[PDB]
Amino acid sequence: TVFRQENVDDYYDTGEELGSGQFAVVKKCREKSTGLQYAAKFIKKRRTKSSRRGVSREDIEREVSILKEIQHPNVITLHEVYENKTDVILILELVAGGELSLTEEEATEFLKQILNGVYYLHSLQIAHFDLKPENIMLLDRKPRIKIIDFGLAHKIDFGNEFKNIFGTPEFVAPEIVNYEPLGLEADMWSIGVITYILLSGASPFLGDTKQETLANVSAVNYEFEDEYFSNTSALAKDFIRRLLVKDPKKRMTIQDSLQHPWIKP
């Protein structure tokens, strides 16, 4: 699939930088025709078939196709796509409040929005595969959150996928660490990690090196530290405990998480 090949600078003016990854930079921008503001994500293309630098066209097209499907208040939306020889430029909804220890009411206020967004995605059989605090942004810093960064997202048409998929060690599920088939359940593990950090300020599996962290993830090597959780409700801990489960089949689903007594009204 091809994208708009006019010069993006003829239609948008860029401003301050908003975000910056391995092969992508995000710039605030303004559409000349409407004055409306967006975030332009410049993704570097692979230059050769076997290069390791840049993002493969297959991966860029997958991200664009998924983004085109989504319209939900808790997930970033895609406005336009441009391209040239060096970059694909996604014109994305501007999320300007930056990245997301709290009281349980504050934590559940944000968590519920995360769950609503993930419920939408999983209902469409979209696994995000990169859920982590860095990918949970606010619109204005009770703020509105937006799930961002669909660079690892995959449609899960057969219940699972078996691809080269691997995010940030602190947040990946054991099946990712062990290179097993992956489904929607991996996102639910990541939500459990996010909830643990939201309530305590501490990362449940983090070791001194990436390999240690991954070994901890695979072994489900975490515990609730009393110094961090002494005033946290047992129901909150129950919610986390039913997500940080090694067997994906025994882990709470997104629907389970919405009906759990800590969440359900």
Quote the CA–CA distance of 111 and 89 in Å, as a whole number: 30
* Method used experimentally: X-ray
Quote the CA–CA distance of 87 and 123 in Å, as a whole number: 31
Q: Which strand (E) or helix (H) includes residue 255?
A: helix 254-259
* Sign of the torsion angle spanned by Cα atoms 115, 121, 122, 124: positive
Q: Where in the chain is the domain with CATH 1.10.510.10?
A: 98-265
Q: Where in the chain is the domain with CATH 3.30.200.20?
A: 7-97
248 neighbors 178 (Cβ within 8 angstroms): no
Helix/strand/coil percentages in the chain, nearest 5: 35, 20, 45
Q: Could you tell me where the DSSP H helices lie in 70-209?
A: 104-123, 174-177, 185-200
Q: Could you tell me where the DSSP H helices lie in 161-253?
A: 174-177, 185-200, 210-218, 226-229, 234-241
| Three-class DSSP category at 245 | coil
Residue 23: CA count within 13 A, CB half-sphere: 18
* Resolution for the entry shown, Å: 1.8
113 is in an annotated binding site: no
CA dihedral 215, 155, 76, 248 (to 10 degrees): -40
139 is in an annotated binding site: no
Across 195-215, b (16+ Cβ under 10 Å) vs e yields bbbbbbeebbbbbeeeeebbe
99 is in an annotated binding site: yes
Q: Domain 98-265, CATH 1.10.510.10 — does that match?
A: yes
**Would you call 130 a catalytic residue per the annotation?**
yes
101 is in an annotated binding site: no
16 is in an annotated binding site: no
22 neighbors 5 (Cβ within 8 angstroms): no
123 is in an annotated binding site: no
User: What DSSP string runs through 57-82?
Assistant: HHHHHHHHHHHHH---TTB--EEEEE
41 is in an annotated binding site: yes
* Of the options 3.90.1170.30, 3.40.50.300, 3.40.47.10, 3.30.200.20, the CATH number for the domain spanning 7-97: 3.30.200.20
Question: Which of 236, 175, 230, 240 has the alpha carbon at shortest distance from 204?
Answer: 240
8 is in an annotated binding site: no
Token pair in block for residue 221: 């090597």
102 neighbors 111 (Cβ within 8 angstroms): no
Q: How many CB atoms lie within 10 A of CB 172?
A: 26
146 neighbors 137 (Cβ within 8 angstroms): yes
Q: Is 193 left (phi over 0), alpha (psi -120 to 50) or beta?
A: alpha
193 is in an annotated binding site: no
CA distance readout (Å), 116 to 22, 65, 140:
29, 21, 18
| Three-class DSSP category at 252 | coil
| Three-class DSSP category at 173 | coil
Q: Which of 130, 157, 187, 226 is catalytic?
A: 130
Question: Which of 167, 154, 166, 162 has the alpha carbon at shortest distance from 125?
Answer: 154
